[PDB]
Design a protein around this ligand. Structure first.
Ligand code: ZN
Length: 215
């Protein structure tokens, strides 16, 4: 949701630096559901349970476009999901595995997977960014939203930065450009939040993704 702190910048050079694995998602149902996500392995991407539920039991309905720049401008093309594993906890988190594309390339090869933080030093009041694809902006455009962490408890985190429908599943980056959480949404006039990747979540990811990298 939009908050008093609405500080967002468009990322045009999407394949530069830590932005490459930030991904645009389209789920074809009924209508087209839009969301975001982040590549964290050779064939794996993280997003929310609710974006994955938009496929209504059909993984093939989910397409990921890493580093998408704008409508029909996908520098790495797209990838179709083949298998989905939802987080067993309360956290709105899901793991999506993709099959290679027509050129036999893997989603985690055309782009360098993001580095996951161990979150040892993460704390309230730290400056972070949530980068993904807001639906109030031009189609398939990547935007970085700036703010501070305002709440940390268990596997949940909240922050004061703005997001909009479409940002579902956007990675939360700390200053070191490591993924510390996965954005799920927010509450009007209150806050936006994400699944905080603590020890429990980390162990879950490690058990389901053999090549995920934690700093
Ligand atoms: Zn700014």
């Amino acid at each position: 949701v939009i908050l008093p702190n609405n500080d967002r910048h468009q990322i045009t050079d999407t394949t530069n630096g830590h932005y490459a694995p930030v991904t645009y998602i389209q789920v074809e149902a009924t209508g087209t559901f839009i969301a975001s996500g982040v590549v964290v392995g050779k064939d794996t991407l993280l997003t929310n349970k609710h974006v994955v539920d938009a496929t209504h039991g059909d993984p093939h309905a989910l397409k990921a476009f890493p580093s998408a720049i704008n409508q029909d401008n996908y520098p790495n093309g797209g990838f179709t999901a083949e298998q989905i594993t939802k987080y067993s906890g309360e956290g709105d988190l899901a793991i999506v595995k993709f099959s290679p594309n027509e050129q036999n390339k893997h989603i985690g090869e055309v782009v360098k997977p993001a580095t996951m933080s161990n979150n040892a030093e993460t704390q309230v009041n730290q400056n972070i960014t949530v980068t993904g694809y807001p639906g109030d902006k031009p189609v398939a455009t990547m935007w970085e939203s700036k703010g501070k962490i305002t709440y940390l408890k268990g596997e949940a985190m909240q922050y004061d930065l703005s997001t909009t429908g479409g940002n579902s599943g956007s990675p939360v980056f700390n200053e070191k450009n490591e993924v510390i959480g996965i954005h799920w949404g927010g509450v009007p006039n209150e806050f936006n939040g994400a699944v905080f990747i603590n020890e429990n979540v980390r162990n879950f990811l490690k058990q389901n993704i053999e090549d995920i990298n934690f700093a």
